[PDB]
Design a protein around this ligand. Sequence first.
Ligand SMILES: *[C@@H]1O[C@H](CO)[C@@H](O[C@@H]2O[C@H](CO)[C@@H](O[C@@H]3O[C@H](CO)[C@@H](O)[C@H](O)[C@@H]3O)[C@H](O)[C@H]2NC(C)=O)[C@H](O)[C@H]1NC(C)=O
Ligand SMILES: *[C@@H]1O[C@H](CO)[C@@H](O)[C@H](O)[C@H]1NC(C)=O
Ligand SMILES: *[C@@H]1O[C@H](CO)[C@@H](O)[C@H](O)[C@H]1NC(C)=O
Ligand SMILES: *[C@@H]1O[C@H](CO)[C@@H](O)[C@H](O)[C@H]1NC(C)=O
Lengths: 51, 206, 52
Amino acid sequence: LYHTENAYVSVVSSHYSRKFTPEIAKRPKVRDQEGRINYYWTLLEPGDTII
Amino acid sequence: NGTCYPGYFADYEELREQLSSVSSFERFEIFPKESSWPNHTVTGVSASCSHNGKSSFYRNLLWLTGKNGLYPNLSKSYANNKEKEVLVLWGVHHPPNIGDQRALYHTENAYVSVVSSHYSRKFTPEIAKRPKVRDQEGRINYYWTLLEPGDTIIFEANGNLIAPRYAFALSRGFGSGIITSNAPMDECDAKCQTPQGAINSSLPFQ
Amino acid sequence: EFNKLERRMENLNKKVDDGFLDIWTYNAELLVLLENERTLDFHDSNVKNLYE
Ligand SMILES: *[C@@H]1O[C@H](CO)[C@@H](O[C@@H]2O[C@H](CO)[C@@H](O[C@@H]3O[C@H](CO)[C@@H](O)[C@H](O)[C@@H]3O)[C@H](O)[C@H]2NC(C)=O)[C@H](O)[C@H]1NC(C)=O
Ligand SMILES: *[C@@H]1O[C@H](CO)[C@@H](O)[C@H](O)[C@H]1NC(C)=O
Ligand SMILES: *[C@@H]1O[C@H](CO)[C@@H](O)[C@H](O)[C@H]1NC(C)=O
Ligand SMILES: *[C@@H]1O[C@H](CO)[C@@H](O)[C@H](O)[C@H]1NC(C)=O
């Protein structure tokens, strides 16, 4: 899928900062899927920037 | 005037709640500046913490840097022989690019380890480009802990450490707090204080 | 039970407990005090009614 083995995601704001790394494992199927997707959210103030 | 260098303060509201019940403390030097770090340089300042028109740094923290082109491992320990709780604070630096990290600490994979009898944590720097807050793209994260009498705390690092310099020995008491007000200070004496003014009365309601 | 980094929750729990205890103590004492007078007035009125 991504042609790499060590991947990173970085989300940075003026007062928000986080880094994410994937975890590869075998899990019980929930909706016929063994992979997962994690969801995140944030609130951005007027005049601010997110990267 | 809060944190002149941008960053994140961990458990800030819990620290305020703890300080709301302290009546006095004693500020003592836990790691003296002139005799604790022979292998490192202890003169580091930033333009975002300027004082009297010149760049400076905090007063209870120390910025260590490599000397002679090397940053050897550091391991320091302190035992609480004060019959009181001790508040210890430190920090971790996150530079904006890998070139700055290599120029500052001469390593690419750095770790900080802080260990007590009932406290243990490990920190790793994160390098990224961020929007400038006070003309800075790097960050510093601040951490604190309370040390019980007779206990020991150990710091180990090979880079990116903002070392403690001063600590406080806390003394507790009842009937204190932190209030926000705009009123001026006068020379009176009263039994009740409010953010608007003092009350001299024995009535049951207000 | 709370750990060392959960002092605000502990303080809120203590505040709730103390407030409820104060309110119920006040209610009980006031009720007893107020009924005690009405009982005696009731007895006096009964005696007066019998006499009349
Ligand atoms: C402590 O708080 C004072 C304010 O109570 C800070 O002074 C203020 O500092 C900012 C940032 O340096 C100044 O803004 C700058 O102004 C210059 C010139 O106008 C402009 O070129 C910059 O782009 C920026 O906007 C601000 O003028 C200044 N205010 C006063 C009254 O001096 C001070 O920096 C704080 N110090 C610490 C260590 O936190
Ligand atoms: C570095 O400091 C230590 C003290 O912790 C000292 O023993 C050592 O000799 C110093 N390094 C050199 C090269 O002298
Ligand atoms: C410094 O620490 C690293 C990692 O623990 C280690 O590999 C290295 O040998 C240490 N340096 C010395 C001089 O022992
Ligand atoms: C409050 O009353 C005390 C009692 O004499 C007095 O000493 C004090 O000055 C009074 N304070 C104010 C603000 O009136």
